[PDB]
Design a protein around this ligand. Structure first.
Ligand SMILES: [Mg+2]
Ligand SMILES: [Mg+2]
Ligand SMILES: [Mg+2]
Ligand SMILES: [Mg+2]
Ligand SMILES: [Mg+2]
Ligand SMILES: [Mg+2]
Ligand SMILES: [Mg+2]
Ligand SMILES: [Mg+2]
Ligand SMILES: [Mg+2]
Ligand SMILES: [Mg+2]
Ligand SMILES: [Mg+2]
Ligand SMILES: [Mg+2]
Ligand SMILES: [Mg+2]
Ligand SMILES: [Mg+2]
Ligand SMILES: [Mg+2]
Ligand SMILES: [Mg+2]
Ligand SMILES: [Zn+2]
Lengths: 115, 153, 224, 110, 307
RNA sequence: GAUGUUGGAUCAGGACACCCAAAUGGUGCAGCCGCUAUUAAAGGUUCGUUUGUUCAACGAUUAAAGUCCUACGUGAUCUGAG
């Protein structure tokens, strides 16, 4: 359950992810009709005074049994084309994400470790 | 909602409740019969039952000893629990306490009262409810049925 | 010398509710039907396990996981347990259903009992205690018939912690509280203690009749 | 909120003479075979429980005299005796309370 | 004449108290096992299956809930319903009930004779069964009729099907507005005084009355409800236990009413089921101890491997 | 010899001079968008930054984020920033 105004941590390696800022990156908007985002949902992130789109990878809220539950809320930076703006994603990603190939194809392609 | 709850709320809270039961239990183990409020007698019933089940666990068991410490306030009573009150219950599994309802109290309060008692105490016998004897027209009428069921077998 | 104590998998212990006992004989017959295919080994909270799952989405259908068993809960067929491990610096937990048909092989690498009956407090402990070697080999048991009790105090990150672990309702003997706390807070924590609870008698749960009955039920089920 | 009008005695007779506010007639009353006083079917006889209670009080007084102080209480079983009675062997080795009244008819020897 | 109150056990002695009980239970087992064979007794004419037909129902006991896994890897939770004692009781002809469908009255679990009414015990003495606790009326077409006093077992619903369930939901008593209806509250901290729950404005200034439907605090939950479109997964023959899908309204251990689904998608599904009802005597075969739907992972099995 | 007055909160009853959903006419309608007109009130009609603010601007969305009346609904239910 990741919602408006949640502080998220950017897992992929990107310009905007690693460089410091006086504000932790905040989630503005979740694109489900429910205000709650889950693994494999899509977010609008406010990072370093600009808006980027993201993909929720893992989160600290429990989920259906046998889903991996992560210590921190992890997002991958993403543009409108669905292309990950990052090169690769180190910290492990839910194997459930391979269910939808259509949207997440490239994101999956740059993913290192699955759990 | 109250669904599926086995405890009343009595006294100033949960602690007060435990201490109310403490007093009553001391009273019961000392005097072997007491007359108290029906809600509270009926509440005490369970604890009065299982306290005797620790008595059976033997004098040497530690978990029973620190239990007898909390629940029996007057210290003399503890040897009474182990050496007296426990041994005279042996064969009987659950048969310890008689609980019966008394006429309501005579004070302006008019509560609903019960007497609770250990079996085999030396006190005058409580005027228990009598069962109708067998010479009764109806019971005498059932004997025939019984003997006929014996005659058919 | 043969010390003999029978370890009954905790989910053969039926809950306190007023449920009709017929329900429990059913669950037992099903999970005992399940025992005969997939072999379920003993283990405790604190013991290290490695589970093999059937994964639809991966290429190698097997998914491997390894971690501590943090807690167990359930009854009947719905038995579960939780594994915890740090991969690359990410804390990861999984909730597994014991009797789930997707699970293929469960394997115990290290059989161990740590002081508390649940550790969720390894969430606020330092990253070492949650880290384990993915490739470590099974370290076997010497059949001492003593499950080794490892008493290990732990270090914790600065406060706040996901739960308040200092408080009496949790009864945590595992945490090292001298280094993580001050005397004031140790007096605070003592204001929430409810001393009379251990002496509550009636609050105690009686089993052994049921224990005999269902253990005899398991013998009877292995025989046939 | 203040009542808008005095109610008539008619309305009041309706409300407070309702069959629900009337005291119900208790049908479970019987007589006790011993003293022939009245008692309710599920409750002990009041008058019987009285003489039981009085005797318990007095026997507790005398067994308070047989005890020296507040905290001192017997480890033996107790057996109470009445005028003319001598202990059986089953009952010997136990604390004995001796009483003037000849043993009351409702209290048995056992 | 001031006549006293009497219960059944009042005047019996020590001797006669167990005797009465043993006697009543004896006559009960006797009367039950006697009705155990419907087909060889005086069976009513059996009619074929027409397409507009509607089957008899069942009365069950809700046991509890249990997890169950499909061959596909999905996890469902199911509710165990048990048939304890089920017999059809009386029969109402077409004209005598709805003008349309014939009423078949079905009885539930066995109770003790001692606490029921004179009229009711009379009804069961003219029948020959023990008294049933819960009695419900099923609507049924003329070709589905059975004969009064006939046993109904739990093989009646073959695995995979959709059933419907009616029962009294869990009673929560007199509940405020935030429960009963689910109105938001008032905010807690900003200086609100004594309002944190209350319904708020209940009507409009002009109307000067409050409308006949208006939602207010009151009785919540002891009422009849019905769950439709539940799938039946597996059946136990020996203990007579249905495993239905999802949840059934009522407390656990409550008495529950089961029928085939009246939903428009399933209308003709009744052509494959044993129709008057199921008859263990007639087929003269032993049904497997469990009847599983084709989807379900059985309690023993290969332990699924995807590929 | 008192019908306590702005905006919110809660709960909404109604109109149709439809903002969405549903059938259609005309087009300077090829299709995609559109722009107009007819018929249809069972159901919907978002979350924020600044203002006491309704209004308005602005960020982000939604199938849409209607126009109104009801003592500018609703203070013996609440809030008083005004
Ligand atoms: Mg800026
Ligand atoms: Mg209760
Ligand atoms: Mg009180
Ligand atoms: Mg009770
Ligand atoms: Mg928290
Ligand atoms: Mg209730
Ligand atoms: Mg609230
Ligand atoms: Mg308040
Ligand atoms: Mg005030
Ligand atoms: Mg006036
Ligand atoms: Mg409205
Ligand atoms: Mg119009
Ligand atoms: Mg409307
Ligand atoms: Mg106004
Ligand atoms: Mg106002
Ligand atoms: Mg008003
Ligand atoms: Zn009397």
């Amino acid at each position: 359950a990741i919602q408006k105004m949640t502080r998220v941590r950017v897992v992929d390696n990107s310009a905007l992810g690693t460089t410091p800022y006086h504000r932790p990156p905040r989630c503005i908007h979740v694109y489900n009709k429910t205000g709650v985002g889950k693994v494999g949902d899509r977010i609008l992130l406010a990072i370093r005074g600009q808006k980027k789109k993201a993909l929720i990878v893992g989160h600290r809220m429990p989920g259906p049994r046998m889903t991996p539950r992560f210590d921190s809320n992890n997002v991958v930076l993403l543009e409108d084309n669905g292309n990950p703006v990052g090169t690769r994603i180190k910290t492990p990603i839910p194997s459930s994400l391979r269910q939808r190939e259509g949207e997440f194809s490239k994101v999956l392609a740059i993913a290192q470790n699955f759990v | 909602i109250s669904h599926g709850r086995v405890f009343r709320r009595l006294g100033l809270g949960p602690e007060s409740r435990i201490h109310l039961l403490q007093n009553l239990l001391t009273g019961l183990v000392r005097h072997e019969r007491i007359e108290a409020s029906w809600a509270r007698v009926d509440e005490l019933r369970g604890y009065a039952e299982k306290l005797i089940d620790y008595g059976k666990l033997g004098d040497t068991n530690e978990r029973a000893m620190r239990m007898a410490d909390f629940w029996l306030t007057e210290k003399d009573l503890i040897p009474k629990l182990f050496q007296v009150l426990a041994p005279r219950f042996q064969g009987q599994n659950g048969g310890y306490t008689r609980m019966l309802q008394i006429p309501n109290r005579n004070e302006q309060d008019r509560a609903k009262m019960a007497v609770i008692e250990y079996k085999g105490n030396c006190l005058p016998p409580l005027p228990l409810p009598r069962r109708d004897s067998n010479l009764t027209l109806l019971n005498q009428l059932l004997q025939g049925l019984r003997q006929d069921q014996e005659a058919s077998s | 010398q043969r010390p003999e104590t029978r370890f009954l998998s905790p989910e053969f212990i039926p809950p306190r509710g007023r449920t009709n006992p017929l329900k429990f004989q059913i669950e037992r017959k099903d999970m005992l039907e399940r025992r005969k295919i997939l072999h379920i080994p003993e283990f405790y909270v604190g013991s290290i396990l490695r589970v093999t799952t059937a994964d639809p989405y991966a290429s190698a259908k097997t998914s491997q996981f390894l971690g501590i068993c943090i807690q167990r809960s359930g009854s009947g067929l719905g038995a579960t347990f939780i594994l915890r491990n740090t991969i690359e610096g990410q804390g990861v937990e999984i909730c597994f259903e014991l009797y789930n048909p997707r699970i293929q092989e469960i394997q115990v690498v290290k059989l161990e009992k740590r002081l508390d009956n649940s550790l969720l407090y390894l969430r606020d402990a330092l990253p070492e205690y949650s880290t384990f070697d993915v490739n470590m080999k099974p370290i076997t048991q010497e059949f001492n018939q003593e499950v080794p009790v490892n008493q290990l105090k732990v270090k914790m990150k600065p406060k706040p912690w996901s739960k308040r672990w200092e408080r009496p309702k949790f009864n945590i003997k595992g945490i090292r509280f001298d280094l993580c706390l001050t005397e004031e807070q140790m007096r605070e924590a003592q204001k929430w203690s409810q001393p009379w609870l251990e002496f509550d008698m009636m609050r105690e749960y009686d089993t052994s009749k049921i224990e005999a009955a269902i253990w005899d039920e398991i013998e009877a089920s292995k025989n046939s | 909120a203040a009542p808008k009008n005095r109610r008539s005695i008619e309305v009041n007779r309706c409300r407070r003479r309702n069959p629900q506010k009337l005291i119900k007639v208790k049908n479970n009353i019987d007589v006790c075979p011993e003293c022939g006083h009245l008692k309710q079917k599920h409750i002990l006889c009041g008058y019987c429980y009285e003489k039981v209670r009085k005797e318990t009080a007095e026997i507790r007084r005398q067994m308070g005299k047989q005890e020296g102080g507040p905290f001192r209480a017997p480890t033996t079983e107790t057996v109470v005796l009445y005028s003319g009675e001598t202990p059986s062997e089953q009952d010997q080795g136990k604390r004995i309370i001796e009483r003037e009244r000849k043993r009351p008819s409702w209290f048995t020897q056992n | 004449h001031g006549k006293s109150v009497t219960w059944w056990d009042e005047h019996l002695s020590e001797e006669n108290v167990p005797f009465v009980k043993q006697l009543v239970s004896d006559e009960n087992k006797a009367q039950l096992a006697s009705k155990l064979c419907p087909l060889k007794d005086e069976p009513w004419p059996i009619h074929p299956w027409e397409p507009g037909s509607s089957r008899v129902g069942l009365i069950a006991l809700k046991l509890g809930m249990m997890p169950l896994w499909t061959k596909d890897g999905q996890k469902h939770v199911v509710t165990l319903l048990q048939v304890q004692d089920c017999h059809v009781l009386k029969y109402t002809p077409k004209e005598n009930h709805n003008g349309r469908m014939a009423a078949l009255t079905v009885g539930g679990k066995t109770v003790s004779h001692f606490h029921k009414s004179a009229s009711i015990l009379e009804f069961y003495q003219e029948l020959g069964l023990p008294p049933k606790q819960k009695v419900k009326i099923f609507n049924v077409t003329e070709n589905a009729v059975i004969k009064p006093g006939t046993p109904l077992y739990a093989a009646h619903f073959r695995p995979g099907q959709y059933v419907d369930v009616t029962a009294k939901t869990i009673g929560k008593g007199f509940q405020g507005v935030m429960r009963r209806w689910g109105f938001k509250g008032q905010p807690a901290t900003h200086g609100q005084t004594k309002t944190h729950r209350r319904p708020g404005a209940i009507s409009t200034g002009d109307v000067a009355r409050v409308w006949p439907g208006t939602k207010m605090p009151g009785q919540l939950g002891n009422i009849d409800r019905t769950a439709f479109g539940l799938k039946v997964w597996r059946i136990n023959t020996k203990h007579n236990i249905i495993y239905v899908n999802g949840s059934v309204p009522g407390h656990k251990n409550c008495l529950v009413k089961i029928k085939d689904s009246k939903l428009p998608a399933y209308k003709d599904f009744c052509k494959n089921l044993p129709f008057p009802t199921y008859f263990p005597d007639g087929d003269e075969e032993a049904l497997p101890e469990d009847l599983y739907d084709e989807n379900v992972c059985q309690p023993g099995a290969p332990s699924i491997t995807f590929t």
